[PDB]
Design a protein around this ligand. Structure first.
Ligand SMILES: [Cl-]
Ligand SMILES: [Zn+2]
Ligand SMILES: [Zn+2]
Ligand SMILES: [Zn+2]
Ligand SMILES: [Zn+2]
Ligand SMILES: [Zn+2]
Lengths: 396, 396, 396, 396
C-alpha cells in the first residue's frame, strides 16, 4: 500500500513539477525519487487481473533514467518524462482498480491483487517516500496499531431508517401517541406526536425519548440542533406497522419542551445539553439520546383552544420535533461522507467492470447495508479499498 | 496561466517559508525560484486595467535578489524580501483581476489581458514550476486533452427551476393530477400529486415521472435519495400555467411507491436503483429519470377513508415525493459549488469594477443563465476565469 | 494519426513525383523522407485485425532504401519504387480500414486499431512530416486545444424531419391552423397554414414561429432565404398526428408578412434579418428562429375575395412559406456535407465487411440518427474515423 | 497584399511542416523563408485596430532566427518555432481584420490599413515568396494587366428579385397575361401566364420574353435548363403592382413551346439553345434572353378542353415556365458563391466589431444591394477585402 501510494505520489509530483522551463533545483529530489522508482521497477513483470470484466493487462518496465545536467527543463525533457509518466500512471491506475474490486473475509487489510502483493516485497520498499495524505497516514498508523483518525464533513454514520413507534394505539388509529423518525446520513429528524395533546397526562406533559446507537464512535463532533422536525410536520397517511391498514397523521407543531440531548459513550454520559439550539460539541460518543416533551399550553386563545378538545375525536395532533445534524466529526474508522469520493469511486469501479458480489460487502456496495453491519472484517476491507481509491484519485 | 500560477505560488511560498530564523536549507530551492522570478521580471513593463472602472496601472521591476550563503534567515533577510513580495503580490492580483473581467467568443481558453499575453512569451517560461493545484493541474491536462475532472462538493449543476406540469386539469382546478418540482443547485425535490387519489386509475396506481437533463456529465457522484419532498407538502396557492388564475394545493403525503432512479448517459441506462433510499452512487450520467407511483392504500382507517372520497369534491390531495441531493461528484468541466469561491470571486471582481456585459457571459455573472446555456465557448471562458480566480485566491 | 497521415502523404508524394525522367533534385527531399520511412518501418511487424469480415493481415517491412544515384529517374528506378510503394499503400489502406470500423465509448478519439496504436509509439515519430490537410490540421489543433475549423459546403446539420404542428384542429380537420416543416440536410422548408385565412385573428394576422436547434454551433454561414416553400404549396392528404385518419390540405400561397429570421447563440440574438431575402450571413449561431405571418389581404379582387369566405367551409387554405438553405458554413465539429466523401467512405467500409453494430454509432452509420444524438463520444469517434477516411482517400 | 499573403503562407507552412520528429531536409527551405521573415520584420512597430470596436493592438518584432542543426526536429525546436508562429499569426490575423473593415471610394484596391500600407514598403519585399492561391494569383495577374479568372460554383450573380410584369391586365385582375420571375443567386425561375390560354392570340400562341442582364460577364458557364418553374406553379394570391389590391393565380402548367435561350455579349448572340434542356454551356455572355411560347393544345381531351373556355371567367390559367441554374462559371471579378466563405468572413468581421457603414458598401454588406450596384470602386474594395479574407482563412 505504501509502495503503491509512493508510486502514485511520485507520478503526481512528476506531472505537477516536471514542466517546461522550470529550474532543475525545483525538481532535483523529485528526479532522484523518480529514477529510484524506475530502477526499482525495471525488469519486473506485472499482471493486473481479470476479475469480472476488468481486462487482463501485462506490464513490463524497461525505462531510461530521467536526465540531470539541465539548468531549466526544456520541452525534450518534458516529453521523455511524459512518455514514462503516462505508462506508469496507466499501470498504477490498473493496480488500484484491481485491488479495489477484491475482498477476503479474513486478512482483508492485506493486499488482494497479485500486483500489490508483488509490490509488498522488500525489493520495492526503496520506492517508498513521503506518506503525507490522510488515508495513507491512517493506514500506516493502523499497521503500527496506533490511534487512527479520519475527519469527515457530514459523516454518513446513520443507515437509512424511516420508522415510527406507537406507544399508545388502537385499531382505529385516532388516539395515537408515539414517535416517528428519519435517521439518514448525518441527519436525525425525530417527532413525538400525541393525538390527545396530553389532555390526560399526569401534568399535561407527554415525555418522548429517542435513542440512536451509532455503530462507530465519533469524536470532536460539531452538531446543529434545531427545535422542529420539518420532515414530520405535514399531513401524512402512514402504513400500519404490520402493513395491514393505513393511519392518518395531521400534525400541529408545538415547540418542544425540556429538550435534553445526551451524547453517551459506552453507556456513560459524556455531553449533556438542555434547551440548547444551534451548534453543540459532542467530544466523544457512540450514542445519542434525545429526550423532549409535549407540554400542553396552559393558556390557549380560542383558535388554539378549539384544536385540542377534552375528548375524542382528535383532528389536530400535537407534534414536537427535533433535528440533529452532525456537520463534521472524527472517527477511528473509515466512513462515507458528503465531501469525499472514496465510496463512490469504489462503487463505480465495481459497477463498471461487473464485479460479482463477494463474501465481504453487500451487493452494489450499498452503504446502508454496509454500515448497519459494519463488522471488523468489513472495516478492514473498506479501509483497504478506500485507501486504494484515494491513491487512485491522486492520478485519475 | 502556468506562469501566472507560478508567480502566485512563488509569492505564497515566499510568504510562508521566508521567515525569521529558518534554516537556509529549508528555503534554498525557494530562494532560487524567487530570484529567477525577479530576474525574469526585471526590465519588463506591464500595463493592467483598462476595462470598466479597473484603473490603469503600470508595473516596473528593478528589484534586487536575495542572498544565498547564510545559514539561518534573520530579520534583515525577511525585511529585504517583504517589500519585493508586496509589490509582486500587488502585480499578480492586478493581472488576475485584469484577466477575470475579460472574455472572448473565439478563444476563451486563451489569455485576454495584455499582461497575461506578454507572460505567455517563452522568456517567462523559466518562472514556471510546481503546478500542483487542482485547477492548474486540470488546466495543464486539458491543454494536452487528457482525461481530467474537477471534484465538487454539492455541484451547482441544476439551474434554478421551480415549475409544475399538469397531466389532468380543468379550468376550476379541483381535480388535478401532475407533478411539481424544484431544481436548485445539487437538489431535486419532485412531488406527484393526484387530487382523486387514483380512485379511477387502472389498478389504483398513478405513475409520475420526472426527467432532469444535466448540462454536463457527472461522474462518481454520491447521491442522497429521500422518499419525501418537504417543499411540496404544505398548502399552497399556485398561479396557473398562464398566470390567469390561482389554484389550490392541499397535500397529504403518502409514501412513494415503486421508486426508481435511472441515471443515464447518452440515453443509455447506466445506474438503476429501485426502492433504495439514503446513499447511492451514480458513476457516470447526464440524465436523472425518477419514476414513482401513488398507490391507494387498499385498507384505510376511518380518518384515512374520510380523506379520500369516491368522487368529487376532493379536499385532501394525495402527494408522493422524492428528494435527490448530489453531495459530491466529478465533472470534466468547471462548475460552481458550495465549497469553492471561484464563481463568487469572479462575480465580486466584475461587480466591484462595473465591468460592461460582454458577449460570453450573462450579465452580473448570473449562474442560472450561465448553466442553462453552458456552451463550449462559455465553458472555455469560465475555466479560464476560474483558474485565474483560484490563482488570485492563493494570495488574496 | 499524424504518423499514419505522414505515411500516406509520403506515399502520395512518391506516386506523384517518382516518375520517369524527372530530375533527382525534384525528388531529393521526397527520397530522403521516403528512406526515413523505410528505415523507421523496417523490422516492425503489424497485424490489421479481423473485426467483421475484414481479413486478418500481417505486415513485415524489410525493404531496401531508394537509390540516390540517378540524375534523372529512369524506368527501372520507377519500377522498384512502385513495388515498395504498392506494399506500403496496401498497408496504409488496411490500417485505415481497420481503424475506421472500430469505435470506443470511453476514449473514441484515441486509436482503436492495434496497428495505429503501435504507430503512436515514439519510435515512429521520425516518419512525421508535413501535415497540411484540413483534417490533419484540425486533428493537430484539437490535440493542442486550439480553435478548430471545418468548412462545409451545404453542411448536413439538420436531421431529417418532416413534421407538422396544429395549433388549432378538430376531428374533421377543416379549420386547421399550424405549421408544417421539412428539415433535411442543409435545408429548411417551413410553412404556416391557416384554413380561415386569419378571418377572426386579433388583427387579421396569424403568427407562425419555427425554432430549429442546431446540434453544433455554426459560424461564417452563407444562407439563402426565400419567401415561398415549394414543398408545402400543393394539395396533400396527410396522416393525423396519431395516424388514425387522414386530412386534406389545399394550400393557396400568400406572401409571408413580417418575415424575421433570428440566428441565436446561447439564446442571445446574434443575427437578425427582417424582410430580407437572398443571401445573408450568420456569423455565429446554434439556433434559428423563423417568425412569419399570414396577413389577411386588406383588399381583394373578386376572385381573391371568393377564395376566402367569412366562415366555414374553407376550400383554399391560406399558406405562407419560408425556405432556408445553408450554402456554406464553418463548424468546430466534423459533419457530413454535400462535397466531402468521409461519411460515405466510412459507411462503405463498414457495409463491405459487415461490421457489427457497436456502442457508439447508429446501426447503419445512418446520418439522421447520428446527428440527432451527436454526443461528445460520437463526435470524438466520428472525427477519428473521418480523419482516417481522409488519410485513406489520399491513397485509395 | 503579396507581402501579407507571404507572411500568412510562411506561417501556414511553418505550422504544417515544423513538427516533432520530421527530417530537417523537409523544412530547410521553409526554415530559410521563416528566418528571412523574422529578419525583415525585426525592429518594426505596427499598430492595428482603432476602428469601430476593433481594439488597438501594438506589435513589436524582436525574434531570433532558427539556427539549430538537427537531423530530425525535436520538441525544443517545435516549441521555439511555435512561440514565434503564434505571435506572427496573431499579428497577421489582426492586420487582416483591420484591412477587412475598411473601404475607400478612391483607390479602393490600394491598402487602407496603416499596417498593410507599411508592409507595402520596399523593405518588406524580401518576405515575398510563393503566391499560389487563386485569390492572390488573380491579384498578381491583375496587377500585371493580365486576364484573371475566379472560378465559382453557383455564382451569386443575380440580385434577389421576385417580380412580375403584366402585359394584359384590368382592375379586376381576372384576365391577365404576363410573366413572373424569381432571380436569386445563380437561379432564375420564370413563368409566362395567360389566363385566356391564348384563345384569341394570333395563331393561338402567346410569346413571352425575359431579359436578365448580368452585372459582370461570365465565361465557361455550365447551365442547367429545365422546362418547368416549380416556384410559379401553385395557387398564389399576389399583390398588386402598386400594392392597392391582390389578384389570384391558379396555374395549370403547359410545357413551354419554342424555347430559346440566348446568351448574349454586348447584344450579340454568343450561344443559342433551342428546345434543348439539361446541361448547356454558355462560353462568354453578359446577358440572358429566355423566349418561350404558350401554345394552345390543338387537340384536347374533355378534361383538358373544360379547363380553357372561349371567354371569361378563366379559372385555370395556362402557365409555361423555365428554370435556369448556373452550376459553375468563371468571372473576371470577384463574386459570392455557394462554396466559399469570403463574403461571410468579411460580413462576420464587420458585424462582430460593429463597423459603421462606410462610403463604398451597403449596410451589413448586403449582397443584393452590393451586386445590384456593383460599381468599379465597389469591385476594387470587394476584391481587396476578399483577398484579405482568403489570406486570413489560411490561419484563422
Ligand atoms: Cl453541505
Ligand atoms: Zn398502527
Ligand atoms: Zn458541505
Ligand atoms: Zn392549471
Ligand atoms: Zn389531426
Ligand atoms: Zn395588377
Amino acid at each position: 500500500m505504501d509502495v503503491l501510494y509512493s508510486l502514485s505520489k511520485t507520478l503526481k509530483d512528476a506531472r505537477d513539477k516536471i514542466v517546461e522551463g522550470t529550474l532543475y533545483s525545483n525538481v532535483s529530489d523529485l528526479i532522484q525519487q523518480f529514477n529510484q522508482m524506475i530502477i526499482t521497477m525495471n525488469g519486473n513483470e506485472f499482471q493486473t487481473g481479470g476479475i469480472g470484466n476488468l481486462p487482463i493487462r501485462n506490464w513490463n518496465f524497461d525505462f531510461g533514467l530521467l536526465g540531470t545536467t539541465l539548468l531549466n527543463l526544456d520541452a525534450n525533457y518534458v516529453e521523455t518524462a511524459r512518455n514514462t509518466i503516462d505508462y506508469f500512471v496507466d499501470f498504477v491506475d490498473n493496480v488500484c482498480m484491481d485491488e479495489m474490486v477484491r475482498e477476503s473475509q479474513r486478512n482483508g487489510i492485506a493486499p488482494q491483487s497479485d500486483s500489490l502483493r508483488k509490490l509488498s516485497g522488500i525489493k520495492f520498499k526503496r520506492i517508498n517516500f513521503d506518506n503525507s495524505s490522510e488515508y495513507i497516514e491512517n493506514w500506516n498508523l493502523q499497521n503500527r496499531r496506533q490511534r487512527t483518525g479520519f475527519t469527515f464533513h457530514k459523516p454518513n454514520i446513520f443507515p437509512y431508517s424511516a420508522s415510527f413507534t406507537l406507544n399508545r394505539s388502537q385499531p382505529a388509529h385516532d388516539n395515537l401517541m408515539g414517535t416517528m423518525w428519519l435517521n439518514a446520513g448525518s441527519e436525525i429528524q425525530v417527532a413525538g406526536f400525541d393525538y390527545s395533546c396530553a389532555i390526560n397526562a399526569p401534568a399535561n406533559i407527554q415525555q418522548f425519548e429517542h435513542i440512536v446507537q451509532l455503530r462507530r464512535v465519533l469524536t470532536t463532533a460539531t452538531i446543529t440542533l434545531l427545535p422542529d422536525a420539518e420532515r414530520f410536520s405535514f399531513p401524512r397517511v402512514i402504513n400500519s406497522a404490520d402493513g395491514a391498514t393505513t393511519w392518518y397523521f395531521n400534525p400541529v407543531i408545538l415547540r418542544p419542551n425540556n429538550v435534553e440531548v445526551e451524547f453517551l459513550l459506552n453507556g456513560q454520559i459524556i455531553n449533556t445539553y438542555q434547551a440548547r439550539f444551534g451548534t453543540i460539541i459532542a467530544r466523544n460518543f457512540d450514542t445519542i439520546r434525545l429526550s423532549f416533551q409535549l407540554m400542553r399550553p396552559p393558556n390557549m386563545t380560542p383558535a388554539v383552544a378549539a384544536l385540542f378538545p377534552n375528548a375524542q375525536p382528535f383532528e389536530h395532533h400535537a407534534t414536537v420535533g427535533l433535528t440533529l445534524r452532525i456537520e463534521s466529526a472524527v472517527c477511528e474508522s473509515v466512513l462515507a461522507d458528503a465531501s469525499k469520493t472514496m465510496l463512490a469511486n469504489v462503487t463505480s469501479v465495481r459497477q463498471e467492470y461487473a464485479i460479482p458480489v463477494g463474501p465481504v460487502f453487500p451487493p452494489g456496495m450499498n452503504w446502508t447495508d454496509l454500515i448497519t453491519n459494519y463488522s471488523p472484517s468489513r472495516e478492514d476491507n473498506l479501509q483497504r479499498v478506500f485507501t486504494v481509491a484515494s491513491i487512485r484519485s491522486m492520478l485519475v
